[PDB]
């Protein structure tokens, strides 16, 4: 997605579990995308170095 699931869900603004879903989305987004693609980038970067 490049942006987490949030473009590929129902809108979570319904009252039940809104904040629960939002921490879920943002935690998923942050952790997997930025940290692990950065791990990959840094690995080949350190390889050239």
């Amino acid at each position: 997605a490049g942006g987490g699931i949030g473009d590929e869900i129902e809108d979570p603004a319904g009252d039940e579990y809104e904040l629960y879903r939002v921490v879920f989305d943002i935690t998923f987004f942050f952790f997997v995308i930025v940290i692990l693609l950065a791990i990959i980038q840094g690995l080949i970067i350190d390889a050239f170095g």
């Binding site: 904040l19 629960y20 939002v22 921490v23």
Partner: peptide
């Protein structure tokens, strides 16, 4: 752990160990 007052009065221990506002 209680919606509106979740981060505040529902769980202050984890709110102090970390500082989240949605759990």
């Amino acid at each position: 752990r209680r919606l509106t007052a979740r981060e505040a009065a529902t769980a202050l221990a984890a709110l102090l160990w970390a500082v989240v506002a949605r759990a």
